[PDB]
Design a protein around this ligand. Structure first.
Ligand SMILES: Nc1ncnc2c1ncn2[C@@H]1O[C@H](COP(=O)(O)O)[C@@H](O)[C@H]1O
Ligand SMILES: [Fe+3]
Ligand SMILES: [Fe+3]
Ligand SMILES: [Zn+2]
Length: 287
């Protein structure tokens, strides 16, 4: 297989987490770029769903409703994309609330340490959280505060240094397991995809085939293959696993607006695969 030349970008972040733009801007731009549709996929939240739906309806661009869920498997950080699930589901709702509170707590303790050595305060970080309580907070907002304070040129510079996972300031966020996340997403009627699973900058080691097999047995629907973080060998490895188990194969930009170099639409999911996501997920039309 090859990355599709046309289709949907199903991996896009907004101000409701670590992106710089609104759901409306995402939809408007996705249409302008000739995309067939888009998804919102903010971290550990559905807070931008109503805004995204409204935009989609006003601008006339099909939308997938999604969330990027922070998770862990043994010692491996794993991000799970969850699409078209019941947002009022009590298990998934409380798991997100817990992750957001754990994130808040962690990110505050990181800023407390960073402020000993850098000119940043909790309020400078809060200034970078664009939707307030409705924004899922994390390291990008710290990086942004350090750029607003003049310590680094870009958000990516900050991550190369003080905000890096290697640094003495770093704290990990307590996260649910991939087995729990998959059960919750399937419980809520959704479709679950392992995000950029071949990406080494994320982890000391990638998920192994055995860990992927156990997630497939849990109900994993798919693998994000077309992503700038997956090198060629890993794309072939993941495509093979997907072919062997009949998994869906997705692509997306991981756009965060000005927060990353990733271009909206730079990788895509084909129309057939989006069809299938929609058919497997919950009918949210009306809700
Ligand atoms: N410019 C950037 N460089 C590195 N990571 C970024 C950037 N913008 C957003 N992120 C995200 O920051 C997240 C880590 O934050 P956290 O989950 O709070 O540890 C990773 O999922 C990221 O890819
Ligand atoms: Fe991710
Ligand atoms: Fe992402
Ligand atoms: Zn992000």
């Amino acid at each position: 297989a090859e990355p599709p030349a046309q289709g949907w970008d199903i991996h896009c972040h907004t101000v409701f987490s670590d992106g710089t733009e609104t759901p409306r801007t995402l939809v408007e731009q996705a249409r302008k770029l000739g995309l067939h549709g888009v998804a919102i996929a903010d971290h550990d939240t559905t807070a931008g769903w109503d805004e995204a739906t409204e935009a989609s309806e006003e601008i006339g661009l099909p939308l997938l409703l999604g969330t990027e869920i922070t998770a862990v498997d043994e010692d491996v950080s794993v991000h799970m994309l969850a699409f078209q699930y019941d947002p009022s589901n009590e298990h998934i709702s409380s798991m997100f609330a817990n992750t957001r509170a754990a994130r808040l707590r962690r990110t505050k303790r990181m800023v407390e340490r960073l402020s000993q050595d850098f000119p940043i305060t909790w309020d400078d970080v809060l200034a970078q959280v664009k939707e307030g309580e409705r924004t899922t907070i994390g390291r990008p907002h710290i990086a942004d505060a350090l750029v607003a304070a003049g310590v680094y040129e870009t958000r990516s510079d900050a991550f190369a240094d003080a905000v890096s996972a290697k640094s003495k300031y770093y704290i990990p966020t307590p996260s649910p397991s991939t087995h729990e996340v998959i059960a919750a997403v399937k419980g809520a009627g959704g479709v679950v995809v392992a995000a950029h699973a071949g990406d080494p900058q994320r982890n000391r080691r990638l998920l192994s085939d055995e860990q992927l097999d156990a997630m497939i047995a849990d109900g994993l629907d798919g693998l994000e293959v077309w992503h700038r973080g997956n090198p060629p060998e890993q794309r072939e490895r993941l495509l093979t696993i997907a072919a062997r188990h009949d998994l869906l194969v997705t692509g997306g930009s991981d756009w965060h607006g000005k927060g990353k170099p990733n271009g909206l639409g730079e990788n895509l999911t084909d129309d057939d695969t989006v069809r299938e996501i929609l058919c497997r997920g919950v009918d949210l039309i009306g809700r």
